[PDB]
């Protein structure tokens with residue numbers, strides 16, 4: 108089946124310039140018998156290629172292209188089935204954009220391509236070509252944020268308690284500063300939140316979730332919570348199904364030597380969106396009391412910015428699923444970059460969670476993320492503050 | 502009950518400068534007895550004001566401020582309940598940002614206010630860093646524009662179980678019609694609800710699919726030429742027949758249309774409710790060469806995370822985000838993020854439901870170039886309606 112594949116990449120700046128003549132000649136020669144057509148764009152610093160052909164032919168070729176030493180930061184932009192070849196023709200063409208003025212390069216593309224009966228601008232491939240021509244440097248990863256320039260540099264369990272908590276740091280690597288700690292519930296045997304709640308009767312789960320937080324506050328109070336923030340996780344129902352959950356939390360966090368402004372409630376985006384009715388009175392009370400709110404798991408499931416017209420949280424936590432393979436995904440890059448910007452405009456804090464690799468950290472930072480949470484920096488620490496690994500140069 | 506209200510605005514650059522010392526002195530003196538506090542930031546062009554007080558007091562005060570001819574382009578950025586007063590003991594106070602070096606204004610703020618973990622503070626910082634971002638440019642002032650009158654030729658067609666009205670999606674910059682949307686109508690010319698209410702509940706998906714034959718017929722006999730055509734379809738209509746896509750292909754071809762010329766609009770909510778099933782249908786549409794749009798984007802709550810799952814050719818911003826976008830910083834921020842994301846992904850964006858020059862001008866300022874609404878063109882029963890263009 109005819110498939111389209113579009114990616115962008117960049118050259119190595121400190122290495123000799125790539126021989127584009129040898130590249131394009133061997134490309135067009137190899138592509139012809141395999142039925143692979145398209146076009147290569149080059150602006151001096153970045154490549155942008157369109158590839159058309161069978162699914163299996165492009166999968167094979169793109170694997171080789173990903174392994175190629177002549178470029179790096181290969182970012183996939185589009186991959187879809189196609190009704191016709193836009194670049195009919197027997198050879199990989201190259202367009203050196205440095206030789207064209209304002210809109211001469213688009214003019215040049217329409218000499219070797221057709222985009223159906225309607226205006227070319229109605230075609231996604233053409234719009235992507237235009238965007239790279241207009242401003243290809245936008246998602247060009249800066250030199251200082253190249254992963255290769257970076258490298259990475261006790262507590263007891265409490266079985267007698269009906270539940271215990273692990274603390275994971277949210278960090279700001281640019282200031283080597285810990286922003287806050289998230290409390291994650293653990294079972295008496297050190298099990299996961301799934302195991303903990305599975306051991307509780309379905310009819311008592313909401314109440315348990317709320318009441319478990321007294322132990323999270325006690326832990327934070329015993330630890331030097333020196334002006335750091337404490338995030339806790341609650342389901343909407345846990346706050347909702349209680350005559351006064353806000354007052355309950357208030358009394359509990361007050362007793363533990365904490366302040367209202369120091370406690371942030373994380374609620375999953377999926378379960379907040381599904382019950383707008385009940386949530387707003389609870390959210391209001393949380394606000395008036397002075398506690399902060401975060402929208403958790405932002406990007407996972409059903410999760411949008413239109414939510415923000417109804418109410419605006421203090422913080423949004425970008426889900427690990429958008430963080431996964433962000434370095435190779437143009438789609439995730441564009442979404443995360445857009446969320447970051449919207450949050451800046453609205454004065455909402457953004458945290459990228461589930462950060463496991465320097466690649467993720469570098470690319471997340473390139474689109475404006477400054478607060479991070481993940482195994483790269485600090486893993487959850489049962490009943491204590493874990494060690495933090497900071498990225499350092501070389 | 503304490504409330505916080507924040508807005509940004511702009512001076513009239515052609516008019517004499519306002520005496521801000523007098524304005525602020527009068528403001529501070531009036532505000533404090535009424536239990537109102539806050540600050541005013543000025544960068545030479547724009548104002549940024551924080552107001553704290555009861556819901557009643559800020560409502561009354563903001564109404565006056567909105568009517569004040571000393572400024573324009575008043576955009577509300579925040580209105581929410583507050584736990585405490587940030588500017589206790591300060592009726593009103595102006596910080597002229599041109600009198601400060603980097604972070605000087607912010608540092609002074611902290612000395613008389615009562616930090617990066619507060620939304621008001623982050624907004625203050627954001628205005629100081631890049632206050633001009635959502636400043637409406639001078640050429641895009643509604644006063645610098647005027648809608649011109651265009652005749653339509655609507656016809657009632659008999660021998661049909663349904664009819665279709667056509668509404669143009671336009672690109673005002675190029676005085677160009679991008680596409681026409683087919684909107685189903687009853688045999689008597691009534692609304693979609695009226696049409697579907699006369700069909701048995703169980704026959705609605707089938708009827709929705711089969712009705713598209715008459716939309717293709719209308720487009721074909723228009724003639725459509727090189728223009729695109731939205732139809733609308735529910736996912737269930739597309740699931741109704743095993744080869745619904747195959748049937749659409751035959752019907753559009755017989756009407757003298759091309760696959761790449763036909764675009765299927767599916768509502769945001771109905772797509773996410775079934776990722777299952779939809780992918781097989783989407784696959785067939787792409788292979789056949791028809792295009793897909795996500796309609797009512799921002800109504801199904803909603804957003805850009807769906808783009809990891811598939812990506813449509815087009816998204817159409819829901820009318821709720823369009824409404825009063827000129828006075829809502831929140832809608833402005835959301836619409837701008839959708840525009841920027843879709844631009845990066847090469848997805849066309851249409852602002853739907855545009856009724857005023859104010860909406861059009863502000864949508865244009867956040868990057869939208871394709872528009873659908875009564876401002877430009879109303880739905881025309883079985884025909885191409887008249888189009889109005891804004892002129893400078």
Ligand SMILES: Nc1nc2c(ncn2[C@@H]2O[C@@H]3COP(=O)(O)O[C@H]4[C@@H](O)[C@H](n5cnc6c(=O)[nH]c(N)nc65)O[C@@H]4COP(=O)(O)O[C@H]3[C@H]2O)c(=O)[nH]1
Pocket residue numbers: 275290291292299300301316319340341342403404427460461462463480481482483487
């Ligand atoms: N793969 C990967 N994972 C990372 C990384 N960094 C952190 N994580 C983990 O991802 C989860 C983050 O919490 P969450 O997204 O709020 O998702 C949490 C949260 O929803 C939750 N949860 C935790 N405590 C509570 C609670 O007290 N009440 C409720 N309702 N839910 C809770 O259960 C979910 C699963 O929790 P956890 O087992 O604690 O697992 C944690 C955590 O340890 C990373 O770099 N890579």
Ligand SMILES: Nc1nc2c(ncn2[C@@H]2O[C@@H]3COP(=O)(O)O[C@H]4[C@@H](O)[C@H](n5cnc6c(=O)[nH]c(N)nc65)O[C@@H]4COP(=O)(O)O[C@H]3[C@H]2O)c(=O)[nH]1
Pocket residue numbers: 668683684685692693694709712733734735796797853854855856873874875876880
């Ligand atoms: N206030 C205002 N309204 C504006 C403006 N511009 C356009 N509209 C209108 O908003 C609707 C736009 O179509 P929609 O969002 O798809 O919303 C449509 C669409 O969902 C729909 N529909 C139309 N045809 C079909 C169909 O064949 N099948 C299905 N399933 N739904 C259809 O029923 C809905 C109701 O459609 P309509 O009466 O045609 O109403 C149209 C339209 O006339 C404006 O500037 N201001």
Ligand SMILES: Cc1cc2nc3c(=O)[nH]c(=O)nc-3n(C[C@H](O)[C@H](O)[C@H](O)COP(=O)(O)O)c2cc1C
Pocket residue numbers: 130133134135137138147154156168171172173175177178199
């Ligand atoms: C920007 C870029 C574009 C490329 N395009 C193609 C191409 O279209 N066709 C191709 O066969 N190889 C292409 N390559 C080269 C492949 O990565 C790889 O070197 C080649 O397929 C190896 O096959 P060979 O040794 O049998 O010639 C490209 C490499 C880069 C850096």
Ligand SMILES: Cc1cc2nc3c(=O)[nH]c(=O)nc-3n(C[C@H](O)[C@H](O)[C@H](O)COP(=O)(O)O)c2cc1C
Pocket residue numbers: 510524527528529531532541548550562565566567569571572593
């Ligand atoms: C940028 C801006 C900020 C203003 N802030 C206040 C204010 O905080 N308090 C106030 O009473 N009037 C404020 N005003 C003035 C009001 O719009 C209005 O002129 C005044 O409240 C009328 O009341 P008066 O008749 O007692 O003067 C502001 C005007 C502008 C242009």
Ligand SMILES: [Ca+2]
Pocket residue numbers: 289340373403
């Ligand atoms: Ca969480």
Ligand SMILES: [Ca+2]
Pocket residue numbers: 403404426427460
């Ligand atoms: Ca998560």
Ligand SMILES: [Ca+2]
Pocket residue numbers: 682731733766796
């Ligand atoms: Ca529609």
Ligand SMILES: [Ca+2]
Pocket residue numbers: 796797817819820853
């Ligand atoms: Ca709509």
